[PDB]
Coordinates of C-alpha atoms and ligand atoms in Angstrom, one line a residue:
Chain A
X1 CA 115.2 120.5 101.7
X2 CA 118.5 119.0 102.3
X3 CA 117.5 115.6 103.5
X4 CA 119.7 113.4 105.8
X5 CA 119.7 109.7 106.2
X6 CA 121.4 107.7 109.0
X7 CA 122.7 104.2 109.1
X8 CA 122.3 101.8 110.7
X9 CA 118.7 102.8 111.7
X10 CA 119.3 100.7 114.9
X11 CA 122.4 99.2 116.5
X12 CA 123.1 96.6 119.2
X13 CA 126.4 96.9 120.9
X14 CA 128.3 95.7 124.0
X15 CA 130.3 97.6 126.6
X16 CA 133.8 98.5 125.3
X17 CA 132.7 98.1 121.7
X18 CA 133.8 100.5 119.0
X19 CA 130.7 101.9 117.3
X20 CA 130.3 104.0 114.2
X21 CA 127.3 105.8 112.9
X22 CA 127.1 107.4 109.4
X23 CA 125.1 110.3 108.3
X24 CA 124.6 111.0 104.6
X25 CA 123.4 114.3 103.1
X26 CA 121.4 114.8 99.9
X27 CA 124.0 117.4 98.7
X28 CA 127.5 118.6 99.7
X29 CA 127.3 120.5 102.9
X30 CA 131.1 121.0 103.6
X31 CA 131.6 120.6 107.4
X32 CA 128.3 122.1 108.5
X33 CA 127.0 119.1 110.6
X34 CA 126.3 118.5 114.2
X35 CA 125.8 115.4 116.3
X36 CA 123.3 115.2 119.2
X37 CA 122.6 112.6 121.9
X38 CA 119.1 112.1 123.3
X39 CA 118.1 109.9 126.2
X40 CA 114.5 109.0 126.9
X41 CA 112.6 111.7 128.8
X42 CA 115.4 114.3 128.3
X43 CA 116.3 117.1 126.0
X44 CA 119.0 116.4 123.5
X45 CA 122.7 117.1 124.2
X46 CA 125.1 118.6 121.7
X47 CA 128.2 116.4 121.0
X48 CA 129.8 117.7 118.0
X49 CA 129.7 120.8 115.8
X50 CA 131.2 121.5 112.4
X51 CA 131.5 117.8 111.8
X52 CA 134.8 117.5 113.7
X53 CA 134.6 119.6 116.9
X54 CA 133.9 118.1 120.2
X55 CA 131.7 120.3 122.5
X56 CA 133.3 121.0 125.9
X57 CA 132.1 118.6 128.6
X58 CA 131.8 115.8 126.1
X59 CA 134.1 112.8 126.6
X60 CA 136.9 112.2 124.1
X61 CA 135.7 108.7 123.2
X62 CA 133.2 110.6 121.0
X63 CA 134.7 111.8 117.7
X64 CA 133.5 113.3 114.4
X65 CA 134.8 112.8 110.9
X66 CA 133.6 113.7 107.4
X67 CA 133.0 116.5 104.9
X68 CA 130.7 117.0 102.0
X69 CA 128.1 114.2 101.9
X70 CA 129.6 111.6 104.3
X71 CA 130.0 111.9 108.0
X72 CA 130.7 109.5 110.9
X73 CA 130.3 109.7 114.6
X74 CA 132.4 107.1 116.4
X75 CA 132.4 106.0 120.0
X76 CA 135.7 104.2 120.6
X77 CA 134.7 102.2 123.7
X78 CA 131.0 102.2 124.6
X79 CA 130.1 103.0 128.3
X80 CA 126.7 102.5 130.0
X81 CA 125.8 106.2 129.6
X82 CA 126.3 106.0 125.8
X83 CA 123.2 103.8 125.2
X84 CA 121.0 106.5 123.7
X85 CA 119.6 107.8 120.4
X86 CA 121.9 109.8 118.2
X87 CA 120.8 112.5 115.7
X88 CA 122.8 114.3 113.0
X89 CA 121.8 117.8 111.9
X90 CA 123.0 119.9 108.9
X91 CA 123.6 123.6 109.5
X92 CA 124.4 124.5 105.9
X93 CA 121.1 125.9 104.9
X94 CA 117.7 126.6 106.5
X95 CA 115.6 124.6 107.4
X96 CA 118.3 123.1 109.7
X97 CA 117.1 119.5 109.4
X98 CA 117.6 116.6 111.8
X99 CA 118.4 113.2 110.5
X100 CA 116.0 110.4 111.4
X101 CA 118.0 109.1 114.4
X102 CA 119.8 105.8 115.3
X103 CA 119.1 104.1 118.5
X104 CA 122.1 102.3 120.2
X105 CA 120.7 99.6 122.5
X106 CA 122.3 96.8 124.5
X107 CA 123.3 93.5 122.9
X108 CA 122.6 90.2 124.5
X109 CA 122.0 86.6 123.4
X110 CA 118.6 85.9 121.8
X111 CA 115.7 85.3 124.2
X112 CA 112.3 84.1 123.0
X113 CA 109.2 85.7 124.5
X114 CA 106.8 84.0 126.8
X115 CA 103.3 84.6 125.2
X116 CA 100.1 85.1 127.2
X117 CA 96.6 86.0 126.1
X118 CA 93.9 87.6 128.1
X119 CA 90.2 87.7 127.2
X120 CA 87.9 90.6 128.1
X121 CA 86.8 90.7 131.7
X122 CA 83.0 90.6 132.3
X123 CA 83.3 94.0 134.0
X124 CA 84.6 95.6 130.8
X125 CA 81.7 94.2 128.7
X126 CA 79.2 96.2 130.7
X127 CA 80.7 99.1 128.8
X128 CA 79.9 98.0 125.3
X129 CA 83.6 97.6 124.4
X130 CA 85.9 94.5 124.6
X131 CA 89.7 94.5 124.7
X132 CA 91.6 91.2 124.3
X133 CA 95.3 91.5 125.2
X134 CA 98.3 89.6 124.1
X135 CA 101.5 89.9 126.1
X136 CA 105.1 89.1 125.1
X137 CA 107.4 89.0 128.1
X138 CA 111.1 89.4 128.1
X139 CA 112.4 88.9 124.6
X140 CA 115.4 90.1 122.5
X141 CA 115.9 91.5 119.9
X142 CA 113.3 94.1 119.7
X143 CA 112.0 93.0 116.3
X144 CA 108.7 91.1 116.6
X145 CA 105.5 90.4 114.7
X146 CA 102.1 90.1 116.4
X147 CA 99.0 89.0 114.4
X148 CA 95.5 88.7 115.6
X149 CA 93.2 86.0 114.2
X150 CA 89.5 85.7 114.9
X151 CA 87.6 82.7 113.5
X152 CA 90.9 82.2 111.6
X153 CA 90.2 85.5 109.9
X154 CA 93.2 87.9 110.0
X155 CA 92.5 91.2 111.7
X156 CA 93.9 94.6 110.8
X157 CA 93.6 98.3 111.8
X158 CA 92.0 97.3 115.1
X159 CA 95.0 96.5 117.3
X160 CA 97.7 98.6 119.0
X161 CA 101.2 97.7 120.2
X162 CA 103.0 99.1 123.2
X163 CA 106.6 98.3 124.2
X164 CA 108.7 98.9 127.2
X165 CA 112.2 100.5 127.2
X166 CA 115.0 97.9 127.4
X167 CA 115.3 96.5 130.9
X168 CA 118.3 97.8 132.9
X169 CA 119.0 94.4 134.4
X170 CA 118.4 91.7 131.8
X171 CA 118.4 93.8 128.6
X172 CA 115.1 92.6 127.3
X173 CA 111.8 94.1 126.0
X174 CA 108.2 93.4 126.8
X175 CA 105.3 94.1 124.6
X176 CA 101.5 94.3 124.8
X177 CA 99.2 94.0 121.8
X178 CA 95.6 95.1 122.3
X179 CA 92.8 94.1 120.0
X180 CA 89.7 96.3 120.6
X181 CA 86.2 95.4 119.5
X182 CA 82.7 96.4 120.2
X183 CA 80.8 94.0 122.5
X184 CA 78.6 93.1 119.5
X185 CA 81.4 92.0 117.2
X186 CA 83.0 90.2 120.1
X187 CA 79.9 88.1 120.9
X188 CA 79.4 87.4 117.1
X189 CA 82.7 85.4 116.9
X190 CA 84.1 82.5 118.9
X191 CA 87.8 81.8 118.6
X192 CA 90.5 84.5 119.4
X193 CA 94.2 84.0 118.8
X194 CA 97.4 86.0 118.7
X195 CA 100.2 84.7 116.5
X196 CA 103.8 85.7 117.4
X197 CA 106.9 85.6 115.2
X198 CA 110.3 86.2 116.7
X199 CA 113.9 85.2 115.9
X200 CA 114.2 83.1 119.0
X201 CA 111.3 81.0 117.8
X202 CA 112.0 78.4 115.1
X203 CA 108.3 78.3 114.4
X204 CA 105.7 81.1 115.1
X205 CA 103.8 80.5 118.3
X206 CA 100.1 80.8 118.9
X207 CA 98.0 81.4 122.0
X208 CA 94.3 81.4 121.8
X209 CA 91.0 81.0 123.7
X210 CA 87.5 79.8 122.7
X211 CA 84.8 82.1 124.0
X212 CA 82.7 79.0 125.0
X213 CA 85.2 76.9 127.0
Chain B
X1 CA 125.2 129.9 133.7
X2 CA 122.9 129.9 130.8
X3 CA 119.3 128.6 131.4
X4 CA 116.2 128.1 129.3
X5 CA 112.9 127.8 131.2
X6 CA 109.8 126.9 129.3
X7 CA 106.1 127.3 130.3
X8 CA 104.2 124.3 131.7
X9 CA 102.3 121.5 130.1
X10 CA 99.1 122.4 128.3
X11 CA 95.9 120.5 127.6
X12 CA 93.8 122.0 124.9
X13 CA 90.9 121.1 122.6
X14 CA 91.2 121.3 118.8
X15 CA 90.4 124.8 117.4
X16 CA 91.7 126.5 120.6
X17 CA 94.7 128.9 120.4
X18 CA 97.9 128.4 122.4
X19 CA 101.1 130.4 123.0
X20 CA 103.9 128.7 124.9
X21 CA 107.0 130.5 126.1
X22 CA 110.7 130.2 126.8
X23 CA 112.4 132.6 129.2
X24 CA 116.2 132.8 129.1
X25 CA 118.8 134.0 131.5
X26 CA 122.6 134.1 131.5
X27 CA 123.4 135.7 128.1
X28 CA 122.4 138.5 125.8
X29 CA 119.0 137.4 124.5
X30 CA 118.9 140.0 121.7
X31 CA 122.2 138.9 120.0
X32 CA 121.7 135.1 119.6
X33 CA 119.5 133.0 117.4
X34 CA 117.0 131.0 119.4
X35 CA 114.5 128.3 118.1
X36 CA 111.9 125.6 118.5
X37 CA 112.1 121.9 118.0
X38 CA 109.1 119.5 117.9
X39 CA 109.3 115.9 118.9
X40 CA 106.1 113.9 118.4
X41 CA 105.6 110.9 120.7
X42 CA 108.1 108.1 119.9
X43 CA 109.5 109.9 116.9
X44 CA 112.5 112.0 116.0
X45 CA 113.3 115.7 116.2
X46 CA 111.8 118.2 113.8
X47 CA 113.3 121.7 113.5
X48 CA 110.5 124.3 113.3
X49 CA 112.3 127.7 113.1
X50 CA 114.6 130.2 114.7
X51 CA 114.3 133.9 115.4
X52 CA 116.9 136.6 116.0
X53 CA 115.3 138.8 118.7
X54 CA 117.6 141.8 117.8
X55 CA 116.0 142.5 114.4
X56 CA 113.2 139.9 114.6
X57 CA 114.4 138.1 111.5
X58 CA 112.8 134.6 111.5
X59 CA 113.5 131.5 109.5
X60 CA 110.9 128.7 109.3
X61 CA 110.7 125.2 107.9
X62 CA 108.1 125.2 105.1
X63 CA 106.3 122.4 106.9
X64 CA 105.6 124.9 109.8
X65 CA 105.3 128.1 107.8
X66 CA 101.7 129.3 108.1
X67 CA 100.8 126.8 110.9
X68 CA 102.7 128.6 113.6
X69 CA 104.3 131.9 114.6
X70 CA 107.6 132.3 116.4
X71 CA 108.0 135.7 118.1
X72 CA 110.0 137.2 120.9
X73 CA 109.9 140.1 123.3
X74 CA 113.5 141.2 124.1
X75 CA 112.1 143.5 126.7
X76 CA 111.6 140.4 128.9
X77 CA 114.0 137.8 127.5
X78 CA 111.2 135.6 126.3
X79 CA 110.6 133.6 123.1
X80 CA 107.1 132.4 122.1
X81 CA 105.6 129.8 119.9
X82 CA 101.9 130.1 118.9
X83 CA 99.1 128.5 117.0
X84 CA 95.8 130.2 116.1
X85 CA 94.1 126.9 115.7
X86 CA 95.3 123.5 117.1
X87 CA 95.0 120.1 115.6
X88 CA 95.2 116.7 117.2
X89 CA 98.4 116.2 115.1
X90 CA 100.1 119.1 117.1
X91 CA 100.3 116.7 120.1
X92 CA 104.0 116.7 120.9
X93 CA 106.7 117.9 123.1
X94 CA 108.2 121.3 122.1
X95 CA 111.8 122.2 123.0
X96 CA 113.2 125.7 122.8
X97 CA 116.9 125.9 122.3
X98 CA 119.6 128.5 122.0
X99 CA 121.3 128.3 118.6
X100 CA 124.8 129.3 119.5
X101 CA 127.8 129.9 117.2
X102 CA 131.3 128.4 117.3
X103 CA 134.5 129.4 115.5
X104 CA 136.5 132.5 114.6
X105 CA 134.2 134.2 112.0
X106 CA 137.0 134.2 109.4
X107 CA 136.1 135.8 106.1
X108 CA 133.3 137.7 107.7
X109 CA 131.5 134.6 109.1
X110 CA 131.5 132.6 105.8
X111 CA 134.0 129.9 106.9
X112 CA 134.7 128.4 110.3
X113 CA 131.5 129.7 111.8
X114 CA 129.2 126.9 112.8
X115 CA 125.7 127.1 114.4
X116 CA 124.5 124.5 116.8
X117 CA 121.9 124.1 119.6
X118 CA 124.0 124.0 122.7
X119 CA 121.5 124.8 125.5
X120 CA 118.0 123.5 125.6
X121 CA 114.9 124.1 127.7
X122 CA 113.3 121.2 129.5
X123 CA 110.4 121.1 127.0
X124 CA 106.7 121.8 127.0
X125 CA 104.2 119.0 126.5
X126 CA 101.1 119.9 124.5
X127 CA 98.2 117.6 124.4
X128 CA 95.4 118.2 121.9
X129 CA 92.2 116.2 122.5
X130 CA 88.4 116.6 122.5
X131 CA 88.4 114.6 125.7
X132 CA 87.7 116.2 129.1
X133 CA 89.3 115.1 132.3
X134 CA 88.2 111.6 133.1
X135 CA 89.2 109.0 135.7
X136 CA 90.2 105.4 134.6
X137 CA 88.1 102.3 134.4
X138 CA 90.3 99.4 135.7
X139 CA 89.7 95.8 134.5
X140 CA 91.5 92.7 135.7
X141 CA 93.7 90.6 133.3
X142 CA 93.2 87.2 135.0
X143 CA 95.6 84.3 134.9
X144 CA 94.5 81.2 133.0
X145 CA 94.2 77.7 134.5
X146 CA 105.2 76.9 136.5
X147 CA 105.0 80.6 135.7
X148 CA 101.8 82.7 135.3
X149 CA 100.9 86.2 134.1
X150 CA 98.2 88.5 135.3
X151 CA 97.8 92.2 135.1
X152 CA 95.3 95.1 134.9
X153 CA 94.0 97.2 132.0
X154 CA 93.7 100.9 132.8
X155 CA 91.4 102.3 130.2
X156 CA 89.7 105.5 128.9
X157 CA 91.4 108.1 131.2
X158 CA 92.6 111.6 130.4
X159 CA 95.0 113.4 130.7
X160 CA 98.3 111.6 131.5
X161 CA 99.6 110.3 133.7
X162 CA 98.5 107.3 135.9
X163 CA 100.7 105.5 138.4
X164 CA 100.3 101.8 138.9
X165 CA 101.7 99.7 141.8
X166 CA 101.0 96.2 143.0
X167 CA 100.0 95.2 146.5
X168 CA 100.8 98.7 147.6
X169 CA 104.4 98.4 146.5
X170 CA 105.3 95.0 148.0
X171 CA 105.5 93.4 144.6
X172 CA 108.0 95.0 142.1
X173 CA 109.9 92.0 140.7
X174 CA 108.4 91.2 137.4
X175 CA 106.1 94.2 136.8
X176 CA 106.0 95.8 133.3
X177 CA 103.9 98.8 133.1
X178 CA 103.5 99.7 129.4
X179 CA 103.6 103.3 128.1
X180 CA 100.1 104.8 127.7
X181 CA 98.6 105.0 124.2
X182 CA 96.3 107.8 123.0
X183 CA 93.2 106.2 121.4
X184 CA 91.0 107.6 118.6
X185 CA 88.4 108.5 121.2
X186 CA 90.9 111.1 122.6
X187 CA 91.3 109.0 125.8
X188 CA 94.5 107.3 127.1
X189 CA 94.9 103.6 128.1
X190 CA 97.7 101.3 129.2
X191 CA 98.3 97.9 130.8
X192 CA 100.3 96.8 133.8
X193 CA 101.3 93.1 134.0
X194 CA 103.2 90.9 136.3
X195 CA 104.6 87.4 136.2
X196 CA 104.3 85.1 139.2
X197 CA 104.8 81.4 140.1
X198 CA 101.7 79.4 139.1
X199 CA 101.9 77.8 142.6
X200 CA 101.4 81.1 144.4
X201 CA 98.0 81.9 142.8
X202 CA 96.0 80.0 145.4
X203 CA 98.2 81.3 148.2
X204 CA 98.9 84.9 147.2
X205 CA 96.5 87.8 146.8
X206 CA 97.4 90.3 144.0
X207 CA 96.1 93.9 143.8
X208 CA 96.4 96.6 141.2
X209 CA 96.8 100.0 142.9
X210 CA 96.0 102.8 140.4
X211 CA 96.2 106.5 140.9
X212 CA 95.1 109.2 138.6
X213 CA 95.7 112.5 140.4
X214 CA 94.1 114.8 137.8
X215 CA 90.7 113.3 138.4
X216 CA 91.5 112.2 142.0
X217 CA 91.0 108.5 141.5
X218 CA 92.5 105.9 143.8
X219 CA 91.5 102.4 142.8
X220 CA 92.5 99.0 144.2
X221 CA 91.5 95.9 142.2
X222 CA 91.9 92.3 143.2
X223 CA 92.9 90.1 140.2
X224 CA 91.7 86.6 140.9
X225 CA 92.2 83.5 138.6
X226 CA 89.4 81.4 137.3
Ligands
ZN1 ZN1 131.7 114.8 97.4
ZN2 ZN1 83.4 90.8 112.4
ZN3 ZN1 126.9 135.5 120.1
ZN4 ZN1 108.8 90.1 132.8

């Protein structure tokens, strides 16, 4: 094990911004480090080898520096194609470990989510299962907190979140949270709520429904 | 030029064996290290191991040592990755990649000789699940009582993928179709939602169009408010 860490873990930037990502190794590796770029759905692309060398076909706005324990990848003026995950990899000793990755996404002004809740359709209940869904539409930054409450009791281990990629046009995310329950538990209780906490909300927002109204 | 071509997506049940391949062209297969990288859904890259097809020397990550075997047949320019017994945790995309060398090889390759993965295959998706092929159940997500949201929940299908459109493609503005999520049951599920003017609910009809080619399902669901 040579273990690598990367900071920041996530980074918001604007076009033409100078951006820098650091990789730190658990021991001295000399120059034996590579940088890779990965875009969603695609295989990674080699940017830099031996800490400092630019692979052919890679634009010069990419650059590598470092030796030993500290390395940096710098993009001097960010272009739209540069919004992708970046991975460092040490090639000093096997296993040739990848760092955890840092995602560079697109910066914009804060946008609060619109929150909607959806109870289970009658059709679904024929099946013995009941899904209640909370939707957060069009918010930024990515960081968000969704809590389910039933009869004011906080739920856990019975929900799942799914998030979209950042929208190409308005640079926002949308997110669905899905609380799944057996029809029996579902009929047992009465009030269902999703509580949302996000930077663009001064106060956490709640949407709910009563199963008998 | 150089090209790495991997075998196709695989859907297997736990306990079954599997061998996926990567066929290379455009360079001397026997004289270059070539290796495998795993990427589980939504997470980073994991280096698994490399093999030198010339002398069949292999180097593995201890995390994968004993779980898999990397092997090659230089006779036919093909590298392999295999499991004798699959787990649900092995669900991932697997990349094969040439591990090429850069530099002069000064001091008999001990300085200025760097290894990096320069050419990659497209990847092979491997899904491990007890589930058998199953078409989706589609449930409406109805708008409540001036902007509204409605959608559809596409639940308990297998394998991926489904495609969702609204009103046969006429409505695109405002649709978010979320990435599918594998559930404990071994079945997939996702949601597709759309935002519309609250005023247009009485005046506009909205339909989920769902296709799941693997089970040959075409479903159309009206989503009505109440
Ligand atoms: Zn030092
Ligand atoms: Zn309960
Ligand atoms: Zn060579
Ligand atoms: Zn939206």
